[PDB]
Paper text:
Surprisingly, siastatin B also inhibits both β-glucuronidases and human heparanase, which cleave β-glucuronic acid residues but not sialic acid or N-acetylated sugars. Herein, we show through crystallographic analysis of protein-inhibitor complexes that siastatin B generates both a hemiaminal and a 3-geminal diol iminosugar (3-GDI) that are, rather than the parent compound, directly responsible for enzyme inhibition. Notably, 3-GDIs are a new class of iminosugar glycoside hydrolase inhibitor, that have been shown to inhibit both GH2 and GH79 β-glucuronidases.
However, we were surprised to find that although each of the structures contains a ligand present with full occupancy in the active site, none of the observed ligands are siastatin B. Three of the four enzymes (AcGH79, BpHEP, and EcGusB) contained “galacturonic-noeuromycin” bound in the −1 position of the active site, as opposed to siastatin B. We confirmed the presence of an alcohol at the 2-position–as opposed to an amine, which would result from deacetylation–through examination of the B-factors within the high-resolution crystal structures of AcGH79 and BpHEP, see Figure S4. When the 2-position is modeled as an alcohol, the B-factor of the 2-substituent is consistent with the 2-carbon. However, when the 2-position is modeled as an amine, the B-factor of this functional group is depressed, which is anticipated for a nitrogen being accommodated within the electron density of an oxygen. The 2-hydroxyl is within hydrogen bonding distance of the catalytic nucleophile and an active site asparagine in all three of these structures, thereby mimicking the interactions seen for natural substrates28 and other inhibitors. The 4-hydroxyl of 4 has galacto-stereochemistry in contrast to the gluco-configuration of the natural enzyme substrate; however, this position also appears to have productive binding to the active site. The 4-hydroxyl of 4 forms hydrogen bond interactions with the enzyme active site, for both AcGH79 and EcGusB, see Figure 2AC.
Numbering used by the authors: 17 to 475
């Protein structure tokens, strides 16, 4: 009904980046490692949610709580630890001290085996010692093994140590570089092959750029963070603003691309979500987050990112997966945007140009030549008030199907489906609605409701 009529032109000759198979990922608080039941081979529910997000992917463990977690080689989990549900750190005050045990690391290894995911593991540079980091790294490497361990990170958001009471106001990149080298040196004595990434901050000029320049021979990739919300001085983030382009993201991405050109280091977005402080109720925990997250995954893949890790845990407002081993796990709305990406699969991005779209400017579209040879198109109609009718040219196929990413309202906290079905227990998901996209004159026409997504697959 009264859609904006737009054109989408796919160009199979306009080659973009190849999405790596381990692009997807999640980030969790290191405090969660206090509970050996969470990242465990026994946590079949959570493992299933990860496998549905990707047969390959990366689990990053870090966050603010990584400055408050203290590995101890003799420790055993307490009764309290065995029930801990560590949600995103809200950033209001110091996290609780937690202990990480051998048992938790042993169980993490088995969780990585059950999921097939690789690991980015934070070490406690904020408050811990080099020697303990070396010992923790040694045990992780011993246990998890080089093939599954992608990187250690030496501190989380070190540019914010002072804001969070971890370093004095004078702490700057030069001070952090000294800490980093002390930790690096200690760890490499115990773990000569230890891989690193950093600086595990948002892009900025005073930390990330000089980090890359100084440590490019010592790290495997650059790790960056991104939250769509800006500083606390901004108007409170809304769904409307979450759907819009974020010029800061665009600039930071360009910055990362220049770092890669200068240093050779690829970049991964190792911690991201919509809003700070564990998210914003009525924004982060809504269907709009699915549109935002799915679109972000493709925007960053098209920009040459190696991958992404959406922060979460517990029942945090922005978590993709919520729950506990005792109570079970569920897919929150954001998960469904990641599910659309998962179902599209890997391949090479292609040119996909929108026209006649000024009245529906928040529609995005990405075309992909899948590794199976089939063309897919992921569309995010992020316009909150405009339906669209998309005239698709540049695809020659006898049959196109669509899987829709839907909820009845953008701010819904539930009622989210993909392919006509919710995700069930343990990540199980099957499409239940089959819809063909009408074809005529070598073109296709796709209707999309306001605030919806679609994944098209062409035979
Ligand atoms: O929700 C947030 O604000 C995020 C910011 N980044 C930190 O590394 C996380 O621990 C968490 O506090």
């Amino acid at each position: 009904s009264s859609p904006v009529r737009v054109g989408l032109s796919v160009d199979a000759s306009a080659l973009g980046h190849t999405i790596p198979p381990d692009y997807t990922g999640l980030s969790y608080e290191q405090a969660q490692m206090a509970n050996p039941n969470y990242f465990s081979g026994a946590n079949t529910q959570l493992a299933g949610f990860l496998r549905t997000l990707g047969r390959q992917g990366v689990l990053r463990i870090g966050g603010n709580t990584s400055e408050y977690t203290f590995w101890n080689r003799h420790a055993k989990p307490t009764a309290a630890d065995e029930h801990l549900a560590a949600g995103p750190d809200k950033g209001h005050h110091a996290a609780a001290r937690e202990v990480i045990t051998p048992e938790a690391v042993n169980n993490l290894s088995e969780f990585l085996d059950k999921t097939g995911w690789k690991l980015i593991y934070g070490l406690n540079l904020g408050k811990g010692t080099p020697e303990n980091a070396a010992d923790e790294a040694a045990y992780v490497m011993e246990t998890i093994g080089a093939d599954r361990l992608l990187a250690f990170q030496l501190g989380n958001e070190p540019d914010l140590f002072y804001r969070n009471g971890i370093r004095p106001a004078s702490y700057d990149f030069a001070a952090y570089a000294g800490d980093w080298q002390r930790f690096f040196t200690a760890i490499r004595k115990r773990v000569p092959n230890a891989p690193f990434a950093g600086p595990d901050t948002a892009y900025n000029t005073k930390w990330l750029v000089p980090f890359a320049d100084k440590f490019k021979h010592d790290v495997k990739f650059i790790s960056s963070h991104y939250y769509a919300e800006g500083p606390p001085t901004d108007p409170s983030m809304t769904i409307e603003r979450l759907m819009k382009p974020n010029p800061r993201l665009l600039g930071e991405t360009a910055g990362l691309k220049q770092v890669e050109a200068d240093t050779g280091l690829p970049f991964r977005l190792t911690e991201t979500n919509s809003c700070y402080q564990g998210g914003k109720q009525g924004v982060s925990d809504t269907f709009a987050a699915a549109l935002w997250a799915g679109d972000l995954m493709y925007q960053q893949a098209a920009a040459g990112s190696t991958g992404i890790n959406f922060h979460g845990g517990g029942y945090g407002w922005y978590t993709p997966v919520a729950g506990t081993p005792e109570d079970g796990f569920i897919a929150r709305p954001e998960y469904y945007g990641m599910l659309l990406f998962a179902q599209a699969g890997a391949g090479q991005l292609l040119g996909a140009k929108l026209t006649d779209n000024s009245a529906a400017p928040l529609l995005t579209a990405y075309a992909l030549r899948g590794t199976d040879g089939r063309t897919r198109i992921a569309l995010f109609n992020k316009n909150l008030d405009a339906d669209v009718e998309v005239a698709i040219s540049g695809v020659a196929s006898p049959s196109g199907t669509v899987l829709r990413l839907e909820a009845p309202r953008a701010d819904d906290t539930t009622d989210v489906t993909f392919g006509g079905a919710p995700v069930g227990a343990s990540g199980s998901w099957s499409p239940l609605v089959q819809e063909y996209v009408p074809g005529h004159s070598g073109q296709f026409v796709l209707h999309m409701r306001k605030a919806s997504g679609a994944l098209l697959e062409f035979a």
